[model samples]
Target: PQFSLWRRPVVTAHIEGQPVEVLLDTGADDSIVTGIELGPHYTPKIVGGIGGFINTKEYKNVEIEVLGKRIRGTIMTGDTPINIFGRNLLTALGMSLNF
Candidate 1:
């Protein structure tokens, strides 16, 4: 992922078969998706946020193309200001940020 001029870590991926924007957020343990339908299969899971706990659904085996590489991981479905790619996804990409 690359940092935007606005200082947000941004990445691109093909989510649910469509290329979409994602943000790299270290604070988030699991990735999340918003503004899109994850089809009809989802597992209910609880996630914690700055605001507190939120109900979410875990979408597994999600295929995503990022940094010219393809990877599969679970993405939690919920309402967010923007889509987030969390540690699980980043770790699979063998990436970490310093500073």
Candidate 2:
């Protein structure tokens, strides 16, 4: 192959429904999705990181499609700077990145 980059399909969804088209990038550790765009009825899950740092809590579970594939995952509430492309996405696609 001349040159290749691992790109996956993404879409935006809240408790409402799939409402927008999401972009893809392999340079992200966790898929970044926006949450600042939501309203009430959405709860966020409070999670902890490696060092017990507070992450997300009370997230909305929804369907996600990538590369002609679809899967289910949760979306945390709050102002996410951008969209998500987390570790699960790569694992689900049977893929990994090399650089």
- What candidate 2 gets wrong by more than 4 Å, as runs, is 1-32, 35-43, 46-57
> Which stretch of 10 consecutive residues in model 2 shows the poorest summed lDDT?
1-10
Write model 2 residue lDDT over 1-99, tens digit each, in one string: 112534445544333454545544455445445544444655555443344433454444556655556666654543454465566556765665557
RMSD to native for every prediction? 2.1, 5.6
Q: What lDDT would each prediction earn against the true structure? A: 0.81, 0.50
Residue pairs in candidate 1 whose N, alpha carbon or C atoms collide under 3 angstroms: none
TM-score of every model versus the real structure: 0.85, 0.48
Best by lDDT: 1
Model 1 lDDT, residue 95, Cα = 80
